[PDB]
Amino acid sequence: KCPTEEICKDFNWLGSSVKNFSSDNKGVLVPPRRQSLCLRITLQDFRTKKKKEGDFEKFIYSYASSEARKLRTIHNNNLEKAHQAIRYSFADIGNIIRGDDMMDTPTSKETITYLEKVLKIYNENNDKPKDAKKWWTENRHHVWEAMMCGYQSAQKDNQCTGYGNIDDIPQFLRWFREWGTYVCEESEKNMNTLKAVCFPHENEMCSSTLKKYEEWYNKRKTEWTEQSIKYNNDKINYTDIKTLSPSEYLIEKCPECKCTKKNLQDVFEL
Numbered sequence: 159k160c161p162t163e164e165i166c167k168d169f170n171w172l173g174s175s176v177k178n179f180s181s182d183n184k185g186v187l188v189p190p191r192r193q194s195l196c197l198r199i200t201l202q203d204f205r206t207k208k209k210k211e212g213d214f215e216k217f218i219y220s221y222a223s224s225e226a227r228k229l230r231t232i233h234n235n236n237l238e239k240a241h242q243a244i245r246y247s248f249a250d251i252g253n254i255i256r257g258d259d260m261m262d263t264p265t266s267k268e269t270i271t272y273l274e275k276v277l278k279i280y281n282e283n284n285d286k287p288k289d290a291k292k293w294w295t296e297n298r299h300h301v302w303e304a305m306m307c308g309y310q311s312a313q314k315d316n317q318c319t320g321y322g323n324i325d326d327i328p329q330f331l332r333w334f335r336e337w338g339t340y341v342c343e344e345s346e347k348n349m350n351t352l353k354a355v356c357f358p359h360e361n362e363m364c365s366s367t368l369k370k371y372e373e374w375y376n377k378r379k380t381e382w383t384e385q386s387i388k389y390n391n392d393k394i395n396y397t398d399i400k401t402l403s404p405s406e407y408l409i410e411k412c413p414e415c416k417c418t419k420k421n422l423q424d425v426f427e428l
């Protein structure tokens with residue numbers, strides 16, 4: 159159930175631009191949604207928001223709220239896809255605030271330093287958080303509330319949801335799943351279009367369609383290859399996915415995905 163009005167009144171797939179993209183984060187691709195995430199804290203924002211207690215936090219909540227409003231605007235006729243994008247952005251905001259977001263950008267680098275300086279000036283003696291990880295733990299509920307408020311303002315939706323444990327899932331795994339939610343859907347649809355055209359002049363239709371299908375396949379196959387590198391490199395440290403292939407991970411462990419052996423494994427894993 160959505161936050162009250164009281165609470166609410168107070169508020170493509172890019173291979174480059176990743177920290178350590180040739181090393182630890184080799185193979186990581188940035189979701190378009192992440193590339194576009196609405197959140198930026200400049201020196202000037204810090205300078206002015208720090209003058210009133212709660213204002214720096216409020217500025218962050220406003221960004222989270224606006225990100226969610228934007229996402230619902232984009233996914234206006236699909237509540238599920240809207241809510242999942244919101245969860246993903248929520249989680250990324252979490253990594254940004256905690257200073258371990260993978261994007262190589264100023265906001266990803268500077269947000270934590272700005273936040274923690276504001277926490278130092280106000281929370282030196284009152285037992286409130288002095289570091290960003292503790293802050294996230296105590297305030298993520300507020301962040302989500304702002305997103306739910308923001309989500310509601312798009313089209314007066316009265317249907318909110320929780321975020322489960324999305325912020326506790328390693329960022330690269332979330333981004334891979336998100337890629338999964340787009341591609342397995344494309345894969346299902348493109349298979350059906352192919353079958354309907356080629357196996358229901360209709361010959362020029364089939365060749366044309368088969369051409370476009372191969373192109374879609376090449377693009378995703380390249381992306382599939384890169385992310386598999388990162389997944390296979392990193393799965394060792396997670397006891398509960400270490401024996402899974404990247405196919406099996408998306409098929410079995412991604413409830414938002416709708417990936418199957420037919421639309422994923424047989425298509426990209428040869």
Ligand SMILES: [Cl-]
Pocket residue numbers: 348351352367370371374
């Ligand atoms: Cl197609």
Ligand SMILES: [Cl-]
Pocket residue numbers: 327328331396399
């Ligand atoms: Cl995990």
